[PDB]
Design a protein around this ligand. Structure first.
Ligand SMILES: CCCCCCCCCCCCCCCC(=O)O
Ligand SMILES: CCCCCCCCCCCCCCCC(=O)O
Lengths: 212, 215
């Protein structure tokens, strides 16, 4: 599959650029980086995640079931995975202590963002659950007849799986919206601390299957 | 140990297909009620063999087991705790049990709801363990130095608790199977097991079908 081959190599380069951004963040939060310089770094990290979503959107058009299944990810990432990636509300919870100290108004805005994300996440999962039910109904009809002498639902099951493409894209849109709203709630230094903890966590997660 | 589990499962599938085929033949024959009851009990005991095989694999490598890499990509798409949600398999096979009495339908629906409740309680347990793992991982990730000790004993050992969840999920599947056998007549149980087995088999072929789609 040419598209997935293209994706795996783009993702390999994405991870290397991501590692550079995380190192820049780690050094910036120890250096005398100016505020405007740190604003541009924060924007570059957000832009780098937007490029991930664009790559994934193109991979979804070549093989959305491969993308959803996360076999391009590690075993540990797959343990946590939700619709091609992570749930944004859970990543927010993971980094939340490393943003502190936040004002009470910011903490409440972060919590309202996490709740709104949790509801959007559940709506998408309930949508996927509806697609799975329709696939299951197609499949059991073919399974109880069990004969190629009688027409099957194979075309309809493929279209069911192809509809996952819209769920991947909307999950990535949610991830993007949560990143961007977090960048509006947080000061620049708080955003940098958040992206630092986020990036280090995602990196460390990957190299955890070796540990087990 | 995982190597052994995969060979047991390989053979377990060969004999599953034989029991499914035997059921399909019986539901076109004039099998006696006692012979059908023996075969229904052969299928229920064959599922018990699966849960015991998985329980032994969970002691060797629970993370492998619960990941479902020993299954197909389609099964993993539908996966809840190393297998299927029994509440959803019940829904898939229900039209094929019909016709049932209104009381049976009610007892089936109550069993599904009680299963859904137990499934969500287990998933909430897993979610708490994942949150505990993540919080341990981010501490090591933010320090990111071999100069400082890590939480990989905490990580490895509370991932060990996944064994308890795998075992109770299988206990819930076996409980659901045996409670359905009590609600249904032998012949209805035969039809349910036939549709269940046929569904599980065909569901595995979904990944091959996707692979061959027009591109
Ligand atoms: C300004 C940034 C603050 C930190 C934000 C942390 C929570 C944002 C969650 C969305 C980020 C998604 C990136 C990972 C992609 C995936 O799920 O695979
Ligand atoms: C007469 C009962 C029919 C309805 C079935 C209710 C729950 C059945 C539970 C058995 C699940 C076993 C399948 C595991 C998947 C696999 O690895 O093949």
């Amino acid at each position: 599959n040419t598209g997935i081959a293209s994706f795996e190599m783009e993702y390999s380069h994405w991870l290397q650029e991501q590692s550079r951004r995380v190192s820049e963040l780690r050094t910036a939060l120890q250096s005398h980086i100016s505020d405007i310089e740190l604003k541009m770094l924060v924007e570059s990290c957000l832009n780098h995640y937007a490029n991930l979503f664009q790559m994934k959107s193109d991979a979804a058009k070549a093989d959305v079931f491969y993308l959803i299944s996360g076999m391009w990810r590690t075993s540990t990432e797959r343990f946590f995975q939700w619709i091609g990636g992570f749930r944004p509300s859970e990543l927010l919870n993971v980094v939340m202590p490393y943003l502190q100290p936040l004002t009470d108004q910011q903490i409440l805005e972060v919590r309202n963002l996490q709740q709104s994300s949790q509801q959007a996440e559940d709506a998408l999962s309930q949508g996927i659950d509806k697609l799975q039910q329709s696939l299951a109904e197609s499949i059991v009809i073919d399974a109880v007849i069990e004969s190629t002498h009688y027409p099957t639902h194979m075309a309809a099951a493929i279209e069911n799986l192809q509809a996952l493409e819209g769920f991947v894209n909307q999950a990535d849109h949610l991830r993007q919206q949560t990143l961007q709203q977090m960048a509006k709630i947080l000061t620049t230094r708080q955003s940098a601390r958040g992206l630092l903890a986020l990036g280090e966590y995602l990196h460390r997660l990957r190299a955890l299957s070796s540990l087990w």
